[PDB]
């Protein structure tokens, strides 16, 4: 028999052992109230409770009111596989679908998109297998109601789950990174740079034990300086090795770009859906990269890290969502609290005028200091 194969060729092959199912917010009366009842502040709800074996292969969500009125940073999505009491997916729902902070913007990637109206149509094509059921939970951590929650959870019911199917995991993390004690010595501008041989102070976006592979990252940086935020290298520790086997060159480099960019760009596997649009790199940037053709495999453990500036010198407000598969459904670290992951104010002309004043004082307050002394 011919071994011919590719996406469109295989689509033409008849498939066995699959049956479509869908859980949705469809109005059960047949009317047009095709959304769930409102969520009060703090309310949790199981929106999908599936029994047995299957594979989720399409999720769509939308929410009313839209951002900024109702921040999608403050609505949590959690997924529990195989009857476990812990979630293997836990994230603010906006960041999970590639919508950072309390913002909205259209973009398309192969697994995740935020489509019209202006980023409110959320869709996900990651496949999520399960053997002993699946539970999807929504939690309203906002101070106002979720007036209307709309969704589709499309999946294939299977009489027999193929034996090598993994379990989908996703974890949101957030840190306000700490500058070096000597200050933000990026590019050696304010002081001498030093080597980072260990990755000890790197930001950690993923850490797990098991067998599997890393498949993606949504990276949300809010930079409080106009200085370039992305000199930092990615560094991966596979299967408990002492020296990281995968070491990068820069953050834009890791995201398949170069030369401190700040342009919107789209590829199915990587892109910049939201750029800072201000002096230097001051403000917010969202970057993503999916490792679909090129996952990062591990047989025992994986620790995915990235420097926050060269040798971790910068103070950055950084959040990430990491996506991966592993052989069984495992637990995640504690989630950042609502207060911990709150979006930060944009640094503005008043703040920078105060920096200029402290800088003028450090130079002896000469009446005609320009600013480049």
Q: Which residues contact 33 (CB under 8 A, 6 or more apart)?
A: 27
Q: Tell me the DSSP string of 20-37.
A: EEEEE---TTSSS--SBP
Examine residue 26 and tell whether it contacts Na ion (CB under 5 A). yes
Q: Which does 357 bind (CB under 5 to 8 A by kind): Na ion, a second copy, none?
A: none
Examine residue 206 and tell whether it contacts a second copy (CB under 8 A). no
Q: Which does 144 bind (CB under 5 to 8 A by kind): Na ion, a second copy, none?
A: none
Distance CA 276, CA 274 (A): 7
Using CB under 8 A as the binding rule, the residues of this chain from 43 to 102 that contact a second copy are 55, 57-58, 60, 62, 64, 66
> Beta strand pairing status for 234-238 and 246-247?
antiparallel
Minimum CB distance to a second copy smaller for 152 or for 175: 152
Minimum CB distance to a second copy smaller for 103 or for 231: 231
Contact with Na ion (CB under 5 A) among 27, 37, 241, 327: 27
Contact with Na ion (CB under 5 A) among 2, 6, 20, 32: 32
Examine residue 226 and tell whether it contacts a second copy (CB under 8 A). no
Which of the ranges 24-32, 71-79, 334-342, 356-364 carries the binding residues for a second copy, by CB under 8 A? 24-32
Please tell me whether residue 156 adopts helix, strand or coil conformation.
Answer: strand
Minimum CB distance to a second copy smaller for 87 or for 174: 87
Element of type H or E holding 253: helix 251-254
Examine residue 34 and tell whether it contacts Na ion (CB under 5 A). yes
Q: Within a 10 A sphere around the Cβ of 205, how many other Cβ atoms?
A: 23
List beta partners, residue 303.
Answer: 207, 237
Please tell me whether residue 357 adopts helix, strand or coil conformation.
Answer: helix
Please tell me whether residue 155 adopts helix, strand or coil conformation.
Answer: strand
Using CB under 8 A as the binding rule, the residues of this chain from 242 to 301 that contact a second copy are 245-250, 252-253, 256-263, 265-270, 272, 292-297
Which of the ranges 70-78, 123-131, 176-184, 356-364 carries the binding residues for a second copy, by CB under 8 A? 123-131
List beta partners, residue 122.
Answer: 61, 114
């Amino acid at each position: 028999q011919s071994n011919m194969t590719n996406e469109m060729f295989d689509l033409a092959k008849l498939k066995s052992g699959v049956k479509n199912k869908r859980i949705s917010s469809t109005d059960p009366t047949g009317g047009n109230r095709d959304h769930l009842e409102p969520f009060k502040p703090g309310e949790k709800r199981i929106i999908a409770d599936i029994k047995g074996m299957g594979v989720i292969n399409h999720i769509w969500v939308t929410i009313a009111p839209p951002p900024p009125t109702l921040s999608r940073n403050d609505i949590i999505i959690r997924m529990y596989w195989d009857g476990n009491d812990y979630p293997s997916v836990e994230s603010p729902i906006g960041p999970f679908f590639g919508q950072g902070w309390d913002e909205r913007y259209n973009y398309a990637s192969l697994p995740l998109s935020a489509g019209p109206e202006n980023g409110t149509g959320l869709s996900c094509y990651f496949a999520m297998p399960f053997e002993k059921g699946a539970r999807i939970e929504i939690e309203n951590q906002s101070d106002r109601n979720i007036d209307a929650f709309y969704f589709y959870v499309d999946y294939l019911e299977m009489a027999k789950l193929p034996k090598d199917m993994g379990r989908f995991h996703a974890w949101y993390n957030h840190n306000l990174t700490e500058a070096l004690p000597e200050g933000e010595t990026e590019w050696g501008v304010t002081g001498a740079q030093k080597p980072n041989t260990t990755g000890e102070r790197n930001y950690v976006f993923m850490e797990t034990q098991g067998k599997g592979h890393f498949v993606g990252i949504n990276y949300y940086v809010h930079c409080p300086t106009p200085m370039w935020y992305g000199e930092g290298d990615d560094m991966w520790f596979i299967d408990g090795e002492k020296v990281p086997s995968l070491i990068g060159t820069g953050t834009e480099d890791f995201f398949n770009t170069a030369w401190c960019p700040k342009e919107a760009f789209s590829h199915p596997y990587f892109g910049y859906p939201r750029v800072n649009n201000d002096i230097g790199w001051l403000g917010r940037t969202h970057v993503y990269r999916f490792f679909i053709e090129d996952p990062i495999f591990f047989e025992k453990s994986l620790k995915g890290t990235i420097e926050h500036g060269s040798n971790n010198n910068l103070t950055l407000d950084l959040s990430t969502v990491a996506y991966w598969y592993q052989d069984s459904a495992v637990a995640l670290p504690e989630a950042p609290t609502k207060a911990q992951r709150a979006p930060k104010p944009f640094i503005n002309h008043v703040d920078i005028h105060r920096w200029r004043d402290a800088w003028r004082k450090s130079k002896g307050n000469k009446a005609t200091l320009w600013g480049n002394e």
